[PDB]
Amino acid sequence: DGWSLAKDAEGIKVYVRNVEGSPLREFRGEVRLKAAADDVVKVLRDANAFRQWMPDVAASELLKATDTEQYHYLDNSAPWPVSNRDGVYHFTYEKAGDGAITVRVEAVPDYLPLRKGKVRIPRAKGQWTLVPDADGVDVTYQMHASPGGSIPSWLANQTVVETPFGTLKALRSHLRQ
Numbered sequence: 001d002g003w004s005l006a007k008d009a010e011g012i013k014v015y016v017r018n019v020e021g022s023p024l025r026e027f028r029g030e031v032r033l034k035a036a037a038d039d040v041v042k043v044l045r046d047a048n049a050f051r052q053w054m055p056d057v058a059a060s061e062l063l064k065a066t067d068t069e070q071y072h073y074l075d076n077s078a079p080w081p082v083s084n085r086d087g088v089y090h091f092t093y094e095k096a097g098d099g100a101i102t103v104r105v106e107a108v109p110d111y112l113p114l115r116k117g118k119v120r121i122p123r124a125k126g127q128w129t130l131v132p133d134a135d136g137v138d139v140t141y142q143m144h145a146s147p148g149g150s151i152p153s154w155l156a157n158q159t160v161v162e163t164p165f166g167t168l169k170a171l172r173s174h175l176r177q
């Protein structure tokens with residue numbers, strides 16, 4: 001597998017695994033929502049709104065959107081008094097033959113110029129997975145980040161579970177509105 005269950009509470013499961021040559025573990029969060037797949041797609045489209053629910057987001061803006069792709073700008077906070085780091089993210093929406101929806105996620109540091117006063121997050125990578133249930137949708141959120149930002153790698157690793165846990169919990173509360 002490589003994976004191992006790291007947390008299970010409030011209906012959410014988070015898996016982690018080592019990635020060779022990195023000091024940061026990859027996570028995979030899992031939750032099941034009473035919503036349709038395209039209800040989560042809408043929320044993930046509304047990047048201007050990330051800051052409203054998505055944890056540790058100080059600010060967010062949609063830069064560009066097509067049918068299949070999107071770019072948004074984020075200013076990230078942190079659980080500790082460290083400088084904020086910002087970044088541009090590329091989402092790519094794919095609908096598989098079976099109605100499963102995959103949103104491929106990718107940091108793109110050079111899309112906009114550096115905003116100086118701020119550290120630019122280096123490449124990140126992962127995806128959301130949205131697969132319909134009889135009555136809802138099964139949600140996967142998986143990310144691996146490389147070294148960068150204002151939070152020591154050793155610190156981000158020891159706290160890596162709280163990112164998908166906090167995100168999925170907030171996306172659940174948020175869809176309920």
Ligand SMILES: [Mn+2]
Nearest residue numbers: 032133137138
């Ligand atoms: Mn299910």
